[PDB]
Design a binder for this molecule. Structure first.
Ligand SMILES: C=C(CC(=O)O)C(=O)O
Ligand SMILES: C=C(CC(=O)O)C(=O)O
Lengths: 205, 205
């Protein structure tokens, strides 16, 4: 499996986690004659792509319905952080608890694209003792961060999204809970393709 | 047109330009009873969405084939910048000329999603006197930046993408040419909807 093409998907936020570019670069160097066709889409779409054979492997968020039909190998777990406007009152706090936002508007992406990550944001607020008020939905976490800059609310994001230094936003660690965003390598059961095997073994030497 | 829904599209990179969140927030405050349905997609898809009626207005890049069928109002022009790995030899230069990359690999997004921006990157290199070697394609400019962090090549991006401070990349202004990335508000000709009118007049008071 030194020649051919591999269709590799990942979520938009997952690309900001170092494991994704690290794996892509490592595979390209070890197997230069395998063309990587890269697709950026959310976990719901990536799982469907794996199921229908339009993707060969994906960096996605584990836990979705039917995930037991695929192989899932954990690649990164990272804390979740609050993103807020620089002038938000909580930005002056020495320690940030989620209860400070019990009456704040949360911006999010539409649940249907990534149920597990969306639900983990809601449950984080529930663990802090409140039902969050969800305001404007935006398509991706980067889109949400840009609306946070316009003071439309706050959000909770994978820690690696703190690289997205939109002017006028700040990222803070959460004093509660330690909610975590998870990234796994996903691929079909009983797909014995040697190219896929070479990719999986590159990601997990 | 104080009630209803407006379907608003924008490209993933365009959200990092302040005009997009500024306009969305201003409209939401002036017309709270109009629901904004936000879609993030590239200029090719946004133009098709406007044509088929699945979008009402878009922040897109002007110049595409058939653009004369729509209204296009310029909203922002910004310089384009080089994004490269922090350890690239040109990162030490006092002034950055595109000819320094004449033998470097350029990473880009697939041309079909945004012909005008893609072609402006190629022509920038041509104006500098070389045909660029295009390496790995990634789906969006943010995806490309993350691969630049893995030292897979360099790219040219709208200046506002310099907010995307992926660890291990740097952004530099270009000594040549002044290549510019353009953002326009696009909507259908002869669409007399009062909600759309209210949005357009919010963006251009
Ligand atoms: C918005 C999401 C959630 C998902 O696709 O699982 C992401 O960027 O990872
Ligand atoms: C990749 C592009 C080009 C386009 O969609 O016109 C962008 O993010 O703006």
């Amino acid at each position: 499996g030194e020649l051919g093409v591999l269709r590799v998907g990942f979520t938009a936020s997952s690309a900001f986690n170092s494991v994704v570019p690290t794996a892509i670069r490592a595979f390209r160097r070890a197997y230069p004659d395998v063309r990587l066709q890269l697709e950026e889409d959310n976990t719901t779409r990536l799982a469907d792509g794996l199921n229908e054979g339009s993707l060969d492997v994906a960096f996605l968020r584990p836990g979705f319905a039917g995930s037991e039909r695929f192989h899932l190998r954990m690649l990164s777990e990272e804390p979740m952080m609050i993103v807020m406007a620089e002038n938000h009152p909580a930005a002056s706090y020495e320690e940030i608890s989620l209860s400070a936002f019990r009456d704040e508007t949360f911006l999010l992406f539409p649940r249907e694209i990534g149920l597990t990550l969306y639900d983990s944001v809601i449950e984080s607020c529930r663990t802090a003792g409140f039902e969050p008020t969800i305001g404007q939905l935006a398509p991706q976490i980067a889109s949400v961060i840009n609306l946070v800059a316009a003071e439309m609310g706050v959000s909770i994001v994978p820690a690696s999204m703190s690289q997205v230094k939109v002017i006028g936003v700040v990222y803070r660690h959460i004093a509660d809970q330690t909610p975590t965003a998870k990234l796994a390598l996903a691929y079909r059961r009983g797909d014995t393709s040697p190219v896929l095997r070479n990719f999986v073994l590159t990601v997990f030497p």
